[PDB]
Amino acid sequence: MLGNLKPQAPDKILALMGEFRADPRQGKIDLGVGVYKDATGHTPIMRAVHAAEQRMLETETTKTYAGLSGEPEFQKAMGELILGDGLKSETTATLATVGGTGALRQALELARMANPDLRVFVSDPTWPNHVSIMNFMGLPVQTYRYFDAETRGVDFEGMKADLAAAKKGDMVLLHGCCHNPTGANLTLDQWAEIASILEKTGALPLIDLAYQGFGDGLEEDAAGTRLIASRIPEVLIAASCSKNFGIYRERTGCLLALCADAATRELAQGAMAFLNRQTYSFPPFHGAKIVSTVLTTPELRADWMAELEAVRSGMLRLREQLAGELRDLSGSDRFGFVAEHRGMFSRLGATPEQVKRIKEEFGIYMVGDSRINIAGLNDNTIPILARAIIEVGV
């Protein structure tokens, strides 16, 4: 029977790394990586994280089945990390998930249950997984302008006109911060306007929060999510702890459902628990316990925030440097956006041909859409990247 199965495409990423490894060039560079890499090209386990696992190993007496929708300690900690003082527990339903992706999948499942005719609006461009999941579910997908290929900034006017078309019950997917892949973000004033479009159209906002703490800071990066949560009655949030906690493989994330009233909240919480049960039953405990241990233990929370801020500042200095080199090499403003972008990714706005030229002539590898990982840069590589950009005519 399994022969009638249709060939599904490879993960792609593996093929990407495949070409890189084959390259016999001594000084090749890889900015295609999608994970954080330190000065030595490694993805370190955060000190706080290693301390939490250690504590856990001494206090966990059993591994019996735990909470179906997650553990309270975790749900509360996450809700406070994201919403802060604005967390209206009475109207907030929480669901521990298998990573941010799990949260996203469940969010789409929940909304489709409440409304079969759900349509989704995604930015142009957006994380590829978004479109695939939705395509897999058979959900109708619509696009809204976002990346201005010329200024490498946000085409706000276009985004606005396109969102205006959304109607009652449609789902508008927004990245809370550090827009993957572009790196271009909305200002608090732009979020406020978007809020007005959402109130007007009656569309449900789904906020993908996977990089809180990699932009301007933990509180700063949650500003937009909070502005929306304050003005829009029903809001869906898909948080990930993969990056900001550096526990990618642990598969830790959560779906937050902000409801207009308690009755609805209980209806949402029940529906969410139902979703986990029918998919894989209980969610993975380990990562969720590393997270709640860090957030509840002052000593650990302090060292975690300290380390993350180190990461954030490191990447920022790197952006400033790259942009600086580019200013010397071109004698113009043009590449100033590199220092304006936030997150660990940035779209150079180079064409596929230019991307190919760079690889063949400079041995530098990046995603085909010219997306680069800032963390991959360094005092030695920046000079090379900068020169390449100018040389290929970007």
Ligand X SMILES: O=C(O)CCc1c[nH]c2ccccc12
Q: By CB under 6 A, name the binding residues for ligand X.
A: 11, 13-14, 33-34, 101, 127, 129, 180, 281
**And the tokens for 139?**
């959900």
In this chain, which of 264, 297, 330, 354 binds a second copy, going by CB under 8 A? Answer: 264
In this chain, which of 75, 242, 244, 276 binds ligand PLP, going by CB under 6 A? Answer: 242
Is 129 annotated to bind a ligand? Reply is: no
Which among 155, 162, 208, 221 is annotated as catalytic? 208
In this chain, which of 194, 210, 318, 323 binds ligand PLP, going by CB under 6 A? Answer: 210
* DSSP string for 61-112: -------TT--HHHHHHHHHHHHGGG--GGGEEEEEEEHHHHHHHHHHHHHH
Q: In angstroms, how far is CA 189 from the centroid of its own chain?
A: 21
Query: CA 84, CA 45: separation in Å to the nearest integer?
Result: 26
In this chain, which of 32, 100, 224, 246 binds ligand PLP, going by CB under 6 A? Answer: 100
**Residue sitting closest to ligand PLP (CB):** 99
Residue placing its CB nearer to a second copy in the complex, 102 or 125: 102
Contact between 136 and a second copy per CB under 8 A: yes
Residue placing its CB nearer to ligand PLP in the complex, 100 or 205: 100
- DSSP 8-state assignment for residue 362: H
Closest separation between CB of residue 187 and ligand X, Å?
23
- DSSP 8-state assignment for residue 282: S
Is 210 among the residues known to form the active site? yes
Among residue numbers 16 through 45, which ones bind a second copy (CB under 8 A)? 33-35, 42-45
Helix, strand, coil percentages for the chain (3-state, nearest 5): 50, 15, 35
Q: To which H or E segment does residue 273 belong?
A: helix 262-279
Residue placing its CB nearer to a second copy in the complex, 14 or 22: 14
What x/- string results for residues 263 through 292 when contact with ligand PLP is judged by CB under 6 A? ------------------x-----------
**And the tokens for 354?**
């230019």
Closest separation between CB of residue 104 and ligand PLP, Å?
6
Is 148 among the residues known to form the active site? no
In the chain, beta strands by DSSP E: 29-30, 92-98, 120-124, 141-145, 171-175, 204-209, 235-240, 252-258, 345-347, 364-365, 371-373
Distances (CA, A) of 99 to 195, 214, 232, 263, 308: 27, 18, 25, 28, 19
Contact between 73 and a second copy per CB under 8 A: no
Is 191 annotated to bind a ligand? Reply is: no
Is 167 among the residues known to form the active site? no
Which among 243, 304, 323, 350 is annotated as catalytic? 243
Instruction: Write out 10-59 in H/E/C secondary structure.
Output: CCCHHHHHHHHHHCCCCCCEECCCCCCCCCCCCCCCCHHHHHHHHHHHHH
270 touches, from ligand PLP, a second copy, ligand X, none (C-beta below 5 to 8 Å by class) = a second copy
Among residue numbers 97 through 116, which ones bind a second copy (CB under 8 A)? 97-99, 101-102, 105, 110-111, 113-115
Which among 203, 210, 229, 339 is annotated as catalytic? 210
Query: CA 12, CA 284: separation in Å to the nearest integer?
Result: 26
CB atoms closer than 10 angstroms to residue 32? 19
Dihedral pair phi/psi, residue 45, rounded to 5° = -90, 120
- Segment lying near ligand PLP (by CB under 6 A), choices 79-87, 94-102, 163-171, 260-268: 94-102
Residue placing its CB nearer to a second copy in the complex, 102 or 343: 102
Is 117 among the residues known to form the active site? no
Q: What is the contact surface with ligand PLP in residues (CB under 6 A)? A: 34, 99-101, 127, 180, 208, 210, 240, 242-243, 248, 253, 281
Catalytic site positions: 127, 208, 210, 243
| Residue numbers belonging to the annotated binding site for substrate | 34, 65, 127, 180, 371
